């Protein structure tokens, strides 16, 4: 940086501070991930200067010639990424796309049928303080008491009852693949429309690491950050069928002028999941959450699901007679990130919790491998059986220090 | 740039396209602006990587002590600027700005009154292809059809017929100033909120040029962006009342994790406004509106409410009988950017129009003076007299080019 550190201490100061933070610690949360200097290059580029409300060729102003190139490359980058047909890459969030998703198929009052919110679904998959509980009628799905996997038969039955005009599959933590073949199957025949959220998977999929929810689901939206490694925005896939009522939804329907800054860093993380090199990332994210889960066990430690088929993992925290809050804030002293988390069927409330979220895409970026892994499930097993050992903590600081130099 | 032209040629080529194009055109769009290369380098930032759901000090993730001390600047910047009690600088645009605040005070169905669409309001004031027509019962109070300047006696008969749950105050192509004091009193007379969204005069207000809506209204709403000159986002404003129901419609309500690195650049972007030298900008922002709107009126052509006493003009091109989109379509061949532009009472659809819509910000901030004005207006003269002589326009386009260097 040239400029900023002259024109506002302040915020270089802060910034500064944070650049630091996110090198010398150990980056558990499972959205987590580090883009790259290309992709903030687009970011900071003159392209936040131009209003370009519409579409590439169908603007609402002119001079969009060149912005109209960048944004038809992200949208091709991603159909090529994922085989949809057809790709809006205007959405400034993943909020916002299952927003402008809600939007297109629902009218207010609607039935939808997402994931349990305390089992692995989104806040903007009926929570009652998001907008999508407040506009819509949403019923919930959960996981089978024993296994953690969703119950497909209570998916069937709960959208037999209610009928919900729109199924949403997919979640914030759930440590297993989901079938959307199923997911599909269940909403042919109570004649619902599939909207999958793959946000947390994203990544995985564009390697081919995770089923691709495109070929079952009429609608799929994602965040273009987490797995998929991009800049922090959203974005839709759907059929040819839906292109114009979805792009009609994001604008003018919820949104005005897209960033095209954004859209162009979304561009740029397409280009990088497209290389031979990110489906060998991909790998070993997932690689590197199943030997840390095994590792976890080896500690003494349950897993909800019993470990994991993607990215992330949840320890059931229960055994040590620990809440996820308090070992959230233990992990904290030492430089290790973790959230908090619900687990399903979990005693704790929301706020409080009896788990933890751990995720690898982070760490794994940053080019930790199978023998970090194993120091860093090391590490949490020393801290969370030693919670009041001040001489236990300094030296899990110190092997934190250790993994990131 | 250093690692976006290696990484993605594709990519490069457009924006380096796209910023030769800001450099040769002259940008007339009354919504666009050029913002400082301390605002881009803190959007090109690390703080992408993220996530910070919640507000300061109260985050649903650990680890957000910087970007804490990065947002509680934005926010008091943003209320050392314009006087707010409360400032929320989540909002992703204008757009999810008022959305926010719709979602804070009213449920769906509610009549709200907001400016005729056709006569300067905005999208997100009740088009019935938006959310916010969609979502509530919008009804709009017009300008006079001789002077266009707002009939405030017809913002009061459709609060006492209609009994809106709120007005909305300001616009997107209203070119003189806002009575906010008498929109308060009609609000106060049938017991109504009322929201200002100040987007377009945001930059005029915090250099004292515009009045402050701040203390007549419950909230304004603002894009970061436009007269304010910061990076492309939102901001709401609002006493100390309202600021709990307003942070929670932005988050857990409409939005998820904000954009750390936008936010930073609204920091940025509020640090400069607070300077002396923004003040100096944005007097002659005026100025060279006042000087255009006098020179364009020397050349033959008549402007809605016959001036203005902002940052924006709008061409009632009827006289010349040219449709907007004639005008904004030669003008675009020659190298001067407009946008056709309905004018009240037009005869012509908002995709044809009767007007083109003219703003300073952009080329005020290149540093174009009085003399600029000048020319630009002769040359403007010179194409839409001429609009059938390719000699004229070869003029007009050389002597754009003399302008620009």
Do not use: W
Not at 46 to 62: Q, S, W
Not at 226 to 237: E, H
Not at 238 to 251: S, T, V
């Amino acid at each position: 940086m040239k400029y900023l550190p002259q024109q506002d201490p302040q915020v270089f100061a802060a910034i500064e501070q944070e650049r630091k933070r996110q090198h010398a610690k150990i980056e558990l949360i499972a959205s987590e991930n580090f883009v790259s200097r290309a992709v903030m290059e687009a970011q900071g580029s003159v392209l936040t200067n131009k209003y370009a409300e519409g579409y590439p060729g169908r603007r609402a102003y002119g001079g969009c010639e060149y912005v109209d190139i960048v944004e038809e490359l992200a949208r091709e980058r991603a159909k090529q990424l994922f085989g949809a047909e057809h790709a809006n890459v205007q959405p400034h969030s993943g909020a916002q796309a299952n927003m402008a998703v809600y939007f297109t198929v629902l009218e207010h009052g609607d039935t939808v049928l997402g994931m349990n919110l305390s089992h692995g679904g989104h806040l903007t998959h009926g929570s009652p303080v998001n907008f999508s509980g407040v506009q819509y009628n949403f019923v919930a799905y959960g996981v089978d008491p024993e296994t953690h996997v969703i119950d497909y038969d209570d998916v069937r039955e709960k959208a037999r009852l209610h009928r919900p005009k729109l199924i949403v599959a997919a979640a914030s933590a759930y440590p297993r693949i989901i079938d959307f073949a199923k997911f599909r199957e269940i909403a042919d025949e109570v004649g619902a429309y599939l909207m999958v959220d793959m946000a947390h998977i994203a990544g995985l999929v564009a390697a081919g690491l995770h089923p691709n929810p495109v070929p079952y689901a009429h609608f799929v939206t994602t965040t273009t950050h987490k797995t998929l490694r991009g800049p922090r925005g959203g974005m839709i896939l759907c059929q040819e069928q839906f292109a114009k009522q979805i792009d009609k939804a994001i604008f003018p329907g919820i949104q005005g002028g897209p960033l095209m800054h954004v859209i162009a860093a979304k561009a740029v993380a397409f280009g990088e999941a497209l290389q031979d090199d990110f489906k060998a990332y991909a790998k070993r994210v997932v690689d590197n959450a199943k030997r840390l889960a095994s590792a976890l066990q080896n500690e003494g430690f349950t897993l909800v699901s019993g470990g994991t088929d993607n990215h992330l993992l949840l320890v059931d925290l229960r055994p040590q007679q620990l809440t996820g809050k308090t070992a959230e804030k233990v992990l904290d002293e030492v430089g290790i990130t973790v959230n908090k988390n619900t687990i399903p069927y979990d005693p704790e409330s929301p706020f409080v919790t009896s788990g933890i979220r751990i995720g690898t895409a982070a760490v794994t970026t940053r080019g930790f491998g199978l023998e970090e892994m194993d120091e860093i499930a090391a590490i949490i097993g020393l801290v969370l059986k030693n919670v009041g050992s001040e001489q236990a903590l300094e030296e899990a600081r110190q092997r934190v220090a250790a993994l990131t130099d």
